[PDB]
Amino acid sequence: MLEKKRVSFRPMNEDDLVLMLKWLTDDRVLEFYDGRDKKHTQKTIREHYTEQWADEIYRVIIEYDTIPIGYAQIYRIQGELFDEYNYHETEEKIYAMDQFIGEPEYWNMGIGAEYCRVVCQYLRTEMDADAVILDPRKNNLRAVRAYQKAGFKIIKELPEHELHEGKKEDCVLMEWRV
Ligand SMILES: [Mg+2]
C-alpha cells in the first residue's frame, strides 16, 4: 500500500517445466539444490515435478517484479512423513516446504526470506496452518540464515539426513509457528 510488493508467488503450471529444466541443468543452482551429480532431462523434470507423492502438495513459482526466479513445493505432513521429519504426530496442521531460487543474479537479496514470510502468512490465513517445517542441510548457511530471518527456529539436528553430492549431510529441523 506504501511500497510496491516485489516478492510474490503463483501456482506452477505445465508451461513452467521449461524453466525447471533450465534451473536444474544449471551447475550453479545444482550446487545447492539436488546436486551437480543429477543429470536432468525433460523426461525427469516432467516425472519428478508432476508426481503426486503426498496427498496434499502445492507447487509454486517464486516471482520478483513478476519475473519467475525460483520454485517451491509445499505439502501437508501426514502419515509416514511425520517419521521422515522426526516430528511427532499431532492434530495441528503441519506443512513442509522445499524451495530454491534458480536465477543466481537474484541470490543474496533477501528474496528467499521474504518469500518464506509471505508463504507462511498465506498458509496461516488461507490454509489454517499451525506450523511450517523445513529440513535444510546444516552447512547450507545461506538457507538456514534466510529461514531464521523469516522466523524459523532450529528445533533439533537430523544427523545423516540427506545425501548431497556424495556426502551424507546432517540437516536441521526448523519450525515456524503461528
Ligand atoms: Mg526439505
Residue numbers in the entry: 1 to 178
Direct quotes from the study:
The monofunctional counterpart (AAC(6’)-Im) of the acetyltransferase domain of the bifunctional enzyme has been identified in both Gram-negative and Gram-positive clinical isolates 14. It shares 60% sequence identity and 83% similarity with AAC(6’)-Ie. When expressed in the Escherichia coli JM83 strain, AAC(6’)-Im produces resistance to a wide range of clinically important 4,6-disubstituted aminoglycosides with minimal inhibitory concentration (MIC) values 8 - 128-fold above those for the recipient strain. Here we report the antibiotic susceptibility and kinetic profile and the X-ray structure of the AAC(6’)-Im acetyltransferase in its apo form and as the binary kanamycin A complex, and classify the enzyme as a member of the AAC(6’)-I sub-family C. An analysis of the structural features involved in substrate binding provides insight into the modulation of the activity of these enzymes.
